[model samples]
Target: PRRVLDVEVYSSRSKVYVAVDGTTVLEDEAREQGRGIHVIVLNQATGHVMAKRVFDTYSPHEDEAMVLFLNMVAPGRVLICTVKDEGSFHLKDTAKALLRSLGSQAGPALGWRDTWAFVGRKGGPVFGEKHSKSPALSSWGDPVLLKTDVPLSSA
Candidate 1:
């Protein structure tokens, strides 16, 4: 069964949001001892969340949570953006770094792999794959077609 859990971060100001499925779960705040890493788990269907005890000092505000949520929800291809009409901190490079770190920390728990499509600025087809060395593909090596031709062309 698929379960969904909503994870919310509460500060003096606002609430940050993220969701999780069976693939991951967050640690209850009691577990964090003012550390720089935080964890959360999501149940996609039930909306039950397990959030870290304390937000890590090294953790990027909100972005860390968002990326962690994404790693669990859409681990393959993550499309991230700045929330509309946010503060100056929203665009800070540190925030992006933190989010990336969150992904890195969760990589093991989420079973990191190279099953990704890396698209560069030279853009032709919006989708393509880059061959890399990863154990995740050892069993099903090589690029597997995610979509079949019908209305799209690379050129």
Candidate 2:
């Protein structure tokens, strides 16, 4: 009674989202903390376990591996865009540009509901995984400041 077709990131949560029998369902029960990585598949309607797996946190190239795996397995179902905002930044223009580009390139294949974005405070502790070697997580670095000098009221 288990057939796992795909898996995707649902925020920073260890949750599951699937199109089950033409119905979209999100499972938000699983918990992953401290160091290990785990994935559990469940019957979206019944909360029954379908499958489960775990991974070591020290695995190299985990981010790249997950991206490639999801690309092959989930295809156009997942779109992850990470944008770091400095202090009190506005993303309306940036978002518009991104949407236009995506629409022009793969609008027919990707839909808004299937897209996901993760925004984290730059130089913050990496979430979900421990012992990450990414340069972005190496240190707290400097805080990103506003790029423009325009007044808040005028701009």
Candidate 3:
């Protein structure tokens, strides 16, 4: 615990929040992110914030924006992700497959308006993943947690 890089996550279908080492790195404010998947990228070794962006999955296109964003991350980086309204409607098979490749257990099962959340590295193992099923949705719950070495290579 002393040398770990802690990544804390809060997620549901309506909002996503990510914190690294007790600091906020990604969060939606004033509803800037309308409807889609929100993401936060961190350096796996340095515990630095690499990027934060939202992909508009609601606007399905021939190219598939979700897949492109996912495909672009570095393999040595960590991904902190969650979904909001209209996440799964237009999501494609390859996009879901990409999620699975990132070590997402729930990614393969993501369906219509599913509230999905995951903490993983590109081409790495999964952590703190959750998915919604049945008539009820994945409402608010305890924030997800994952810990790694500070300069992660040591771990």
Candidate 4:
């Protein structure tokens, strides 16, 4: 069975909702009145949010804006990843750098950079069927490399 993968990229801090089987499981709401940044992850099966972390140093809006890239990494399952730039990197500069390669119509109007990549379901050692990998990340990152893996556990 193949699951659908949908990615949405946004330029502002706002709420993002995900529903499964007519039930809402994930909701990311940016706090409008606070000096904190929040990153939330939820489990669709149980409608239980796995994580909601707030950082006092950065604005939630700024962090939320970076979803343009994070959502592309692992859509529908992973919520976000924060890469700290300890050298006091400017906010606008960071955003510009991140969104520099995205095409003008890859966002909401174009159905959220929505695309699919098929993967092989069966295999054996080195002579198994090959899975497909979509180049959805072609426009983002420099010297791309996989970072930490976040488990989708609801605990």
Candidate 5:
């Protein structure tokens, strides 16, 4: 079987869903969905989750934390990005460029509350999805499929 990553984004309440392998990154006991920019970092070769970072860019202010986190990720890492509760309005161009380089087709032309989703490898190909509707959801439609030679999970 292959390792899979699924990312979903919505323009409404900004709820974001991300599934790494077959498990989701639940933000709370009541709600599995999370808010703001949810960044899922994993080891590219092993498919093991390395770190998870959430950036609340809803403030619409200048914040370089997101940029630095993305830039400093070690090579051979995969960074999965999904926007929740609106962050693109203030998402910097440099950051956009970075995402673009990772194979994001929808990051370059995002508007207010646009649903955005992306999965990227540090030194490999990337996958992304986006929508501009006020009340809508955007997804890759297809999962990020990674063919693994061995099991990266216990189950």
Candidate 6:
């Protein structure tokens, strides 16, 4: 007989944002059950949830609006990354690392054009471009090259 382990399961509609002041904010939406949104703030170093906000009903634009507000208030004090739907696990991991890096002063400077390359789990290699002007208004450029046979480590 196989032993069964019980685990508490929850919805997967979640987003993470890092403030310039090194605050971590998590936004989880109850999309499957069609209910509410939960916003949580945590200390990046201590990993302690300092505050939480819950809304009975959340608007679709509310998420972006809140991010923009924080960006405007602190300007370059917030770093945000969101997984909307149907994202690869590897990409999610990369996004988390990027978010963490953006929160630290030693990381890449905001509003600067930067390129990153990594080995994908399924694909051979992946290359990405980043535009970090604003937390909420920032965008990622399309891949310049992918799955190439050329060695990237040398050049």
lDDT at 33, model 3: 58
lDDT of each residue in 1-155, candidate 6, tens digit only? 01211111122223222222233234344344322323333232333444444322233444343333333322211112222221221223332344333343211232211222221111212111222222232433222221212121211
Please tell me which model should have the higher TM-score, number 3 or number 5. Answer: 3
Q: Where's the lowest-lDDT run of ten residues in candidate 2?
A: 146-155
Backbone clashes in candidate 2 total: 0
lDDT tens per residue, model 2, 84-133: 11100122333334333433222112221122222111122111111111
Clashes of each: 19, 0, 0, 0, 1, 2
In the range 1-155, model 3's lDDT, one tens digit per residue, is 34457776655545667777888787654364556677788777677888887776756762176677768888877787776654665667887788777878876676666666777767787656776643444433333333323336445
- Please tell me which predicted candidate would have the highest TM-score against the true structure: 3
Clashing pairs in 5: 14-85
Native-vs-model 5 lDDT? Answer: 0.57
Question: lDDT of each structure?
Answer: 0.27, 0.26, 0.66, 0.28, 0.57, 0.26
lDDT of 5 by residue, 1-155 (tens): 35543433222342455655556653322243444566878776556678888776655543367778877898567766666656665777887787667777766655556556666666556644544434444432221222222222234
Model 1 error, position 33 (Å): 2.6
Question: How do the residues 1-155 of candidate 1 rate in per-residue lDDT, one tens digit apiece?
Answer: 22212222211111112223223232223332323323333222243442333333233475455444544543222221111111222223554454434342211222112222221111122222222223543332232222211111122
Q: Which should have the higher TM-score, number 1 or number 6?
A: 6
Tell how far residue 109 is off in model 1, in angstroms: 25
| Decoy 3 TM-score against native | 0.79
Query: Which lDDT value does model 2 have at 118?
Result: 24
Error of 6 at 33 (Å): 9.2
Candidate 5 vs. true structure, TM-score: 0.69
Can you tell me which runs of candidate 3 are displaced by over 4 Å? 29-32, 134-151
Off by over 4 Å in 4: 1-3, 6-14, 20-25, 29-91, 104-155
Which portions of model 1 miss their true places by more than 4 Å?
1-8, 12-32, 50-155
